[PDB]
Amino acid sequence: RKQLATKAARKSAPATG
Amino acid sequence: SVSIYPSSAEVLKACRNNSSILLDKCPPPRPPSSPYPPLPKDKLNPPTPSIYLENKRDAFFPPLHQFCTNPNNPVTVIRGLAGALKLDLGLFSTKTLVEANNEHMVEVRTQLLQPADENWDPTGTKKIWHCESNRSHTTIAKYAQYQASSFQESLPFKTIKFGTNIDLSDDKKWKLQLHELTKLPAFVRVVSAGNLLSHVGHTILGMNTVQLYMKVPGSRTPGHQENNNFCSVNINIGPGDCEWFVVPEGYWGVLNDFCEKNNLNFLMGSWWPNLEDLYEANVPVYRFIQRPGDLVWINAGTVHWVQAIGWCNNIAWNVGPLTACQYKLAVERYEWNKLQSVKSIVPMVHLSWNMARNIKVSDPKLFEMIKYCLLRTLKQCQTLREALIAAGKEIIWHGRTKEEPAHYCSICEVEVFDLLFVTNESNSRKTYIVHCQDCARKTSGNLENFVVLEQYKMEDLMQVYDQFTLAPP
Ligand SMILES: O=C(O)CNC(=O)C(=O)O
Ligand SMILES: [Cl-]
Numbered sequence: 001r002k003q004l005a006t007k008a009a010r011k012s013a014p015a016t017g
Numbered sequence: 018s019v020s021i022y023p024s025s026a027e028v029l030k031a032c033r034n035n036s037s038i039l040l041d042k043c044p045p046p047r048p049p050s051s052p053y054p055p056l057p058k059d060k061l062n063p064p065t066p067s068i069y070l071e072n073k074r075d076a077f078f079p080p081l082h083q084f085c086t087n088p089n090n091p092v093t094v095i096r097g098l099a100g101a102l103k104l105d106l107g108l109f110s111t112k113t114l115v116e117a118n119n120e121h122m123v124e125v126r127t128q129l130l131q132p133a134d135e136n137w138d139p140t141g142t143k144k145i146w147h148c149e150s151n152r153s154h155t156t157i158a159k160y161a162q163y164q165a166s167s168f169q170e171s172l173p174f175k176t177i178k179f180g181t182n183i184d185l186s187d188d189k190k191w192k193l194q195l196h197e198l199t200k201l202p203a204f205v206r207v208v209s210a211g212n213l214l215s216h217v218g219h220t221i222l223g224m225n226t227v228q229l230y231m232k233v234p235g236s237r238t239p240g241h242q243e244n245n246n247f248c249s250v251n252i253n254i255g256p257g258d259c260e261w262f263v264v265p266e267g268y269w270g271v272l273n274d275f276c277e278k279n280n281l282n283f284l285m286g287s288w289w290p291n292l293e294d295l296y297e298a299n300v301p302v303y304r305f306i307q308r309p310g311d312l313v314w315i316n317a318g319t320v321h322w323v324q325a326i327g328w329c330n331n332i333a334w335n336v337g338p339l340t341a342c343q344y345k346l347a348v349e350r351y352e353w354n355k356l357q358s359v360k361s362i363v364p365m366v367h368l369s370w371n372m373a374r375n376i377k378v379s380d381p382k383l384f385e386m387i388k389y390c391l392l393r394t395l396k397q398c399q400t401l402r403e404a405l406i407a408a409g410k411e412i413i414w415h416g417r418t419k420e421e422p423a424h425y426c427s428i429c430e431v432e433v434f435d436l437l438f439v440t441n442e443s444n445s446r447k448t449y450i451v452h453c454q455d456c457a458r459k460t461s462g463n464l465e466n467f468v469v470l471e472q473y474k475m476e477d478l479m480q481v482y483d484q485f486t487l488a489p490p
């Protein structure tokens with residue numbers, strides 16, 4: 001069964017650098 | 018009992034080519050103009066809706082739930098919540114957390130210590146909206162030393178560090194912490210049958226799992242609405258206080274315009290409103306102090322920003338009441354996010370289908386909104402499926418595993434429901450990258466190097482759709 005790349009959905013704060 | 022929606026069989030036969038079943042074209046989401054009627058200056062500093070708990074029974078008083086979700090109340094502060102429930106806030110003290118998981122990952126924001134409720138450019142020349150907040154990472158042990166030693170030192174701007182969005186998601190690592198939170202009334206619990214986010218079926222970190230904040234004075238969370246406009250629950254652990262600034266959902270268009278005018282992105286940017294600008298624009302601002310043990314409920318779509326006044330920790334997560342208002346605002350933001358190329362971390366299509374599987378909905382307005390979403394997406398899926406077969410493009414059964422997350426387009430970040438367009442990751446024959454239909458076709462006109470995976474049996478979706486009917490009250 002094909003393996004799909006994924007990223008963990010996550011709440012996070014803005015960043016400016 | 019009147020049905021206004023076609024059956025799944027009728028939807029399917031419509032897609033197989035005469036008359037239309039629905040418009041399908043829809044006014045594009047947009048930011049609201051300043052609310053009408055305008056508020057006079059004497060109404061721009063309203064008191065915060067408050068609940069004063071004394072006894073455990075007070076917290077489980079049913080009307081409390083309805084007070085918090087009332088759309089006219091943008092925020093509710095529930096005073097004395099920890100004390101009423103006899104919650105052991107000590108389980109979330111810096112000392113206790115470090116002892117539990119000394120090496121735990123802590124994301125950090127480094128910021129300038131700004132005076133009062135203001136935000137000045139680094140030279141201290143002029144107030145600006147841009148909020149300098151730079152990312153780094155540390156351990157809970159190291160941030161703890163910084164916080165604790167800070168609390169000793171105290172007793173043209175300084176730099177401070179803020180431990181933020183620390184994930185307390187692992188029940189093995191935080192067993193006692195998380196068990197303590199099951200003492201809460203159902204409507205603010207991280208997990209409950211009445212919480213839409215408990216029907217997602219997979220983890221969204223910080224939304225349906227707990228996040229911790231470790232703060233020193235001046236630590237700021239800049240202006241935002243929650244992801245997909247879900248309500249937020251926040252408990253201050255202490256020992257110090259936090260100050261909250263809140264603007265009603267209806268003014269989010271006005272704040273959006275302020276951001277743009279200050280060359281900042283409303284949805285993704287880092288911005289700290291100038292209260293004097295808001296006052297001149299007749300935007301009302303609720304402002305209050307959250308003490309240790311006080312719970313803050315941020316209603317759906319409420320715009321807010323926060324700063325620590327003392328040294329303290331907070332814990333927080335999202336909840337989604339089973340209401341037309343919450344569902345409407347979540348869908349609106351999902352659609353606006355698409356237009357803005359911003360990822361919705363709540364996969365509203367995936368979620369709506371789970372809601373349809375799991376929840377008997379008795380409110381006609383909410384029922385109609387959900388079924389309308391099912392209709393639009395069922396039609397989109399069948400239409401695409403028919404097109405692909407007409408093109409002789411094969412559809413490979415992929416299915417879903419228990420708890421599998423919703424997938425998103427690696428390019429535009431839109432949720433990709435049911436039919437996944439996948440092509441190999443660079444230099445890999447093992448790993449595949451999900452694309453939406455549009456993005457797949459712009460890489461390959463005819464989908465040459467793409468495979469189409471199907472996650473749900475169409476017969477399954479058709480059944481869920483047909484079985485989703487208005488429940489009796
Ligand atoms: O605690 C903070 O600094 C930020 N918290 C929130 O924005 C929230 O709980 O919704
Ligand atoms: Cl429950």
Ligand SMILES: [Cl-]
Pocket residue numbers: 218418419420421
């Ligand atoms: Cl599942």
Ligand code: NI
Pocket residue numbers: 241242243249315321
């Ligand atoms: Ni928030």
Ligand SMILES: [Zn+2]
Pocket residue numbers: 426427428429430431452453454455456457
């Ligand atoms: Zn895409």
